[PDB]
Amino acid sequence: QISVRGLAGVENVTELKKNFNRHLHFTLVKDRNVATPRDYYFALAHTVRDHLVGRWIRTQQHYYEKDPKRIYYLSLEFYMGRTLQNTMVNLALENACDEATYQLGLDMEELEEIEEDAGLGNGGLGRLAACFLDSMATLGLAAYGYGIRYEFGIFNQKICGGWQMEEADDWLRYGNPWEKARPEFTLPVHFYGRVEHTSQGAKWVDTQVVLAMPYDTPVPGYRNNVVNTMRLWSAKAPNDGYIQAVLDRNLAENISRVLYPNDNFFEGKELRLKQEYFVVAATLQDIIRRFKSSTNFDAFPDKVAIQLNDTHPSLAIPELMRVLVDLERLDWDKAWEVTVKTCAYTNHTVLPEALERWPVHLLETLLPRHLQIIYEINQRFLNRVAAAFPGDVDRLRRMSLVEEGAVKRINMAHLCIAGSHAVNGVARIHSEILKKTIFKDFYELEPHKFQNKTNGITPRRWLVLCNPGLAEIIAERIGEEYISDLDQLRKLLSYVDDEAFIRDVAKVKQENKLKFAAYLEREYKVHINPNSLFDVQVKRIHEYKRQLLNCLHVITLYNRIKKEPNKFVVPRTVMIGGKAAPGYHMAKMIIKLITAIGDVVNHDPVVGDRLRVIFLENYRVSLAEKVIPAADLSEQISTAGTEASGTGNMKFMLNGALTIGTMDGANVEMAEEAGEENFFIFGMRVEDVDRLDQRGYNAQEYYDRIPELRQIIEQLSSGFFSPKQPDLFKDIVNMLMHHDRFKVFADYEEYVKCQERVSALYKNPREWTRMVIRNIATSGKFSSDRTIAQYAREIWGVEPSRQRLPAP
Amino acid sequence: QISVRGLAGVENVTELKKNFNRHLHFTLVKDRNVATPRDYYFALAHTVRDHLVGRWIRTQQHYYEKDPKRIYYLSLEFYMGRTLQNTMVNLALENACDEATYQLGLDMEELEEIEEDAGLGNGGLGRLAACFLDSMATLGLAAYGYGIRYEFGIFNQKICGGWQMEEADDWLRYGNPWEKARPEFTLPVHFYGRVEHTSQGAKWVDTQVVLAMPYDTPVPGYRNNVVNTMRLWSAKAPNDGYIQAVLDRNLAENISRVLYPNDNFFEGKELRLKQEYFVVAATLQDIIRRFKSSTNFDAFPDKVAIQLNDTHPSLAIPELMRVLVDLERLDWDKAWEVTVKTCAYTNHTVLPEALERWPVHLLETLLPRHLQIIYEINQRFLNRVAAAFPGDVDRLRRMSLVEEGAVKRINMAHLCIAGSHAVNGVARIHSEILKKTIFKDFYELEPHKFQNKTNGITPRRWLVLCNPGLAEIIAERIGEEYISDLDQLRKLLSYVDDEAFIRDVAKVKQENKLKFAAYLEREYKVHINPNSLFDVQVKRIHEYKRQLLNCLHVITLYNRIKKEPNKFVVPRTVMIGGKAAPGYHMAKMIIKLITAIGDVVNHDPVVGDRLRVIFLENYRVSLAEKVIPAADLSEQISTAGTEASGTGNMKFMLNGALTIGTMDGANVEMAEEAGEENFFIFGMRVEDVDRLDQRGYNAQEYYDRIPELRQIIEQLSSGFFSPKQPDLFKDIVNMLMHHDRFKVFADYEEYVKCQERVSALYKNPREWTRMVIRNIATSGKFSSDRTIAQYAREIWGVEPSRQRLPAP
């Protein structure tokens, strides 16, 4: 049908049809009389999977022969979403499969909807890992993603009476056609026990053993015949009254049972610590085994790079030391040199409550040898600090890996910096903040360690897959090369005054909005006006992300309409979605508030279809692929200095939405690339927040001086949005008035004014679209291909390649 | 190579090779450079499985079109063993696959050894179900086996210091290529809750829900293109702080976790009750659904037969009543008529400690509606007893389904008889004992209900598969038709004086013994003399099976040798094997005794290779297939009246061993078929046991009057067989002397004398072999094809058919 989806050749279509029928018969054990749509999905998935296999085997064989430096990306989260369409895109099979299925009397799009999301992540950090795997394969790097195969991913969110309910995400129920179990490569992981000191070094004995069984998933590069591996570990009990002993095997296997959904607040739970060590110990054994199958660990850093996705796999540092010292019998200093040159650490937040600080007593019981190694690392590190800054006793306590207090804790971030040759933030402003504030002491000691690597997204999933209409109109003008070289989008600037292109851009957006408007009715029974401005804020629910500020604007628009009903206003559909961490009370209250506002606004006859407020249920990767292409306005309104980067922001920019946002995280670089004239920038900068903190933030001041703000708080307090429970939102009002860490009121005025300017531009479709073109055209920097090339050259010491491997 | 293994045609071999290579590549994601023997096994298994699929789909389609009466075999145990070779045999693919694998440079026999046993049973009852499935498919019956997919089957037995250790049987670790998960046919099962009475009947409310997910395994008939289904249910939690709720799903899923290994003593554990209801509730829903997919339940018994394998699925009776009365709204009397005509019950023991008597309080909590239904069944049943035997108040209490006492219990056997149109024992003597003793009252009320169905074994697994050498020499003389018509073996009587055949029979036995002798060295590092008489007792360890009597004979032979060292004795290898239930202390002591005897006997230089005592570790179906063809003497020495049938006895008879045995279970009919002159029959008959019980059994009498017996007990007591722990076997001596329910001493003299007669015949190879031929030739009655044809005609009301379905 469309050019970017590849050729539908006579031989390929015929071959796909017959392999489809073979799988339906032999693999699923069905015939056309009993087969359900789910059966058809699986037959197609198996058919597409077959095309990966040859390439997968020869890619790994190629790495064995060429022996390049291997990249190991360690993460507790891989937020993969669906695999079928992505695989078709990367193999150039989409049109052929669409044709083959059409001839069998099936709709491929309908079959795609059957696939479960692989929801093995919370949000941005997990999705970054997924985009990174795609880019590493596309750039021909010998890269492996290592994590945990959770049998339950991020919970499915149900909204019941306006409240979030959590439901188990049983994503493996019907099977996963993409993974291959590798029980033959099972490895032991040790827990508890105690340390003995012999004449020949320390020995970790009397341990409990849990088995780590790998499952391999193929990661295809974009049309280069490269297929890399994501290896996820599953926990298994070893085989050695009777009934209870068998039933107690569950305790060992609980390690890989469920993803921790708490992305706001560090909890210090033993099971989470077990998960972190489990992935680290199994992965490092696998790495060392592969390295030996090429005795001298001097070349270890020449052949291995380990990237730590936040501090979650930070135990890699003392585990590598443990193996090198205790098992390989290397001396401390040489083992340390190897460890530092091998490891690199990526930080994803500056918020102190999110930072991992493990109680010493927990590490003492679970990982006694690792604690001893951490103490030794700390002693030697502090000796270096003391020699560099003699007499600076406070610096010593500030930089210690061991934090003092009621409970002694290990600061995992300090451990990561000490044991890594590179530390990076995820956007320029974030990386600067690391050097100036939370890691200032470390920067002063080792300035060379600190880098920036601004985040990106893959344009395969986030343009070609989810927005084929836009990908096509772009390809018509500038060809197809931009898909793996997104900087080529700049060529679109010479079309900003092209009347045909302006019309095509706006048409693609309109089609996307109608498509999503119909999706909302068919699956959720909600009616929206597709002519309205689609105002979208989708991301996890956090106080810092300021969904509450959005809520205040919504109520402001409603109150203005009620005050002057017969005045024209630009119609809006305000959509907010995202999950709240199960333990986060305030975030759960925020969801309730959103739905409560919707209940009043959506049923006011005076409002009509001029304003609609919808809470987008169960926001996840598959939903993002639908809503983002449909959006007109992207809300990126975190308090300056709090969102390390954001990546949702980049997805919207690539897909033809304009951005209203603060100068926070990657928003700064986005505005810089597009030009500030082409962004809706408002609010305090980082410096303004700092000034207000020195003064002391007093919310009462804003309440007293802004009558429109006062009215909203009075409505919240009095029970306007909750007639049956008048004090329902007292916690929210209290926080806003007395305990607001994120200064919602301080940005309110400028936010509302800026929103008026958005409405003004939307009244002029031609000038709106021209600004959109200026955004899409400058979004190239935010490809994860760029990000990964920077990691490769500046951290891992490897060269990317767009050259294809020979096709089987 | 050999005729009975089928044709190895040029096209079939070429096709098998290419499909093997396809699976290795696409299914296993391997190439010849990395592939292990396990990979090769799986590639072959998938290749063979492909040949089943077409036949499986068209068999089920055939049943849909023809709508025959369906047979549902309900069992908590299916002891299947390995599937690969059995499938090749039944599809006539063995030679073709042997050739195909040979040309790929692989040994098929070596690959067969990689397959895990499906050990979903304890012993005879579980293996009977497996043989029955094979025969039902071979006889063209529309039959379904229903059970539980345990993730852990019968434990693997390790012997450590002479003691049994239990190891979890993780049979699914590497995957099961034979099963097909059917998550789309998942059904809810209810537990706990309470009963409400509305105007319109009873309602079971506030229940806990566990999901039942089916897994289907193909059951191929012997060369008739019939492929039936074994459906096994797996427990799943429904999808609806947070972390713990997810982890607690294990509690629901524990239902299908592990097979109860206690085959000696009923325990009354809640988890076992849950397992029993789980299989019953899911199965009955499936049956009713299939019946409706053909409103009037009058025809239900015309289209459905449910066979209860012991009382384990007895809840089928009140569950069917529950569904018909509470859900379908049929009146009680009509529902009862349908239930009785649908259900039939098979009893497998007379030992009172094995009989299921569930505490009322357990049923009250777990299954409150079922208890109410059971009480109502009981009331109406006792009203019939009272009308038939007026004034007989003791009969009323004896026949009650409710047993009185400290704890009230439900007698599940009484429930089964009341609710079934047919009750059968498993051998003629057993069925008679049921009518005369434990179910005498029920027989007097309803004589027409009581039947015999003598057990059998499948000659596919138990001759063709495990003893191809013997199957071939038989086929040379009488053709191949006997394999599905075992009565044809009688034709072999005209070869009893044939010198060529005598030589061939003895040669096949010698080859089997050398094969097994080498197996013992290669896998267990034990040396045996292949010229010795192979004296074998393999079966679960129970007091009633009298492994202890065998032990006494062994010690007698040892003591006789030590007394007269330079006298000639027929050399013997005495092999004993079998598992003890984990809680059965005496059975565990018996295993220790056997190994302890071996430790003394096997290392006595004066004995040499004239006597060897070996404990066969981890006895299971795959081991049975090896040892039985190698045996010369089969030990079937249970106290008369205690072994309901036995089936191991039949396996040995078919494979060319002579039998030393009591007149118990099926031994009686075996001797009858072969002639008593051709069996080594000894010991008390049932009547003799009864006479001794009236007198009172005094073991001291035997100890006082038999000097050889006295010496053995003195050796046991003094610590002759346990020098370091002199009183190790005091429990055994105490039981034998004071508390022996099974009268070991009473059969000792005749046993030893009879064993002398065995040794005498073994000295004359020609006459030994001629007696063997007389046994093999008359073993036809003991085919499960005969057994199943009798069930079909006399209980289920269906006609068997040897006619083949058209090949795809």
Ligand SMILES: O=C(NC(=O)c1ccccn1)N[C@@H]1O[C@H](CO)[C@@H](O)[C@H](O)[C@H]1O
């Ligand atoms: O998503 C997360 N963390 C978590 O999900 C998380 C999970 C467990 C504990 C702490 N945390 N972090 C996000 O990472 C993205 C990628 O760099 C950035 O764009 C976002 O600015 C950042 O908030």
Ligand SMILES: O=C(NC(=O)c1ccccn1)N[C@@H]1O[C@H](CO)[C@@H](O)[C@H](O)[C@H]1O
């Ligand atoms: O094997 C068993 N029971 C068990 O395994 C068992 C399991 C649980 C509870 C009670 N029991 N029973 C056996 O059944 C065979 C088939 O009819 C007969 O040949 C044997 O004589 C009989 O002992």
Ligand SMILES: *Cc1c(COP(=O)(O)O)cnc(C)c1O
């Ligand atoms: C991109 C993405 C995120 C990250 O969004 P931010 O706005 O950067 O927090 C979270 N969840 C999903 C499903 C995503 O796709």
Ligand SMILES: *Cc1c(COP(=O)(O)O)cnc(C)c1O
């Ligand atoms: C046949 C068989 C049995 C039954 O043997 P009996 O001697 O009849 O108790 C038990 N276990 C296995 C593995 C069998 O094959």
